[PDB]
From a paper:
αHBs are oligomers of 5 or more α-helical peptides that assemble into coiled-coil structures with central solvent-accessible channels. We targeted two properties of αHBs: oligomeric state, which directly affects the internal diameter of the channel; and the identities of channel-facing residues, which fine tune this dimension and introduce different chemistries. The αHBs are loaded with an environment sensitive dye (in this case, 1,6-diphenyl-1,3,5-hexatriene, DPH) that binds within the channels and fluoresces. Accordingly, challenging the array with analytes leads to differential displacement of the dye across the array to give a fluorescent fingerprint.
Therefore, we kept e = Ala in most designs and made g = Ala, Asn, Gln, Glu, Ile or Ser to sample oligomer states of 5–8 and internal diameters of ≈5–10 Å27,34. Despite the requirements for aliphatic residues at a and d, up to 40% of these can be changed to other side chains without compromising barrel integrity. We introduced mutations at one or two of these sites to generate four groups of αHB: Group I had entirely hydrophobic interiors, but with different sizes and shapes of channel; Groups II and III had polar uncharged or polar charged residues, respectively, at specific points along the channel; and Group IV had aromatic residues installed in their channels. Finally, one third of the designs were crystallized and yielded 12 X-ray crystal structures, all of which were open αHBs with fully accessible channels.
Residue numbers in the entry:
A (entry chain B), B (entry chain A), C (entry chain B), D (entry chain A), E (entry chain B), F (entry chain A): 1 to 29
The structure:
Amino acid sequence: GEIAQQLKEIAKQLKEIAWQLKEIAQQLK
Amino acid sequence: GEIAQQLKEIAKQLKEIAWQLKEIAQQLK
Amino acid sequence: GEIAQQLKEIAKQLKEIAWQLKEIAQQLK
Amino acid sequence: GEIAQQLKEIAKQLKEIAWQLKEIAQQLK
Amino acid sequence: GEIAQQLKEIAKQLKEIAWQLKEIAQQLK
Amino acid sequence: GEIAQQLKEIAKQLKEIAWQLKEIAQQLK
């Protein structure tokens, strides 16, 4: 459903957010 | 409908959050 | 519905988060 | 009911996230 | 329900995110 | 089912976000 599809997109963006925060952590180190 | 539309907006804002975090990461690099 | 109303509030806060991260990026630059 | 209550709590935490990011931005400024 | 249980976990993680951002703000100060 | 599974993935990514923010906080400390 349309709900599920949007939640999938939300998950995708959160994965990218996680990735960028890992990059930030690495840079600060 | 309405729930899907709000989830779409949530996904849009998360995409912008991901973008800004990438900018921050790039600046630290 | 009540679900939709809370999702709308969630979207609002995510927009503010996006805005503040843009401000942070600008400050680091 | 219960879904609305959890979304309300999600909105509350996102508001706190927005607040803390504003604090970080203000500190960088 | 299963939806409610996952939203509860989402709220929990957002609370931790809020806490860590407060810690970050305190450290920058 | 499918909505629960996507919310589970959303919770998983938020847990990773919380973890990375803790790393950032620890680095600032």
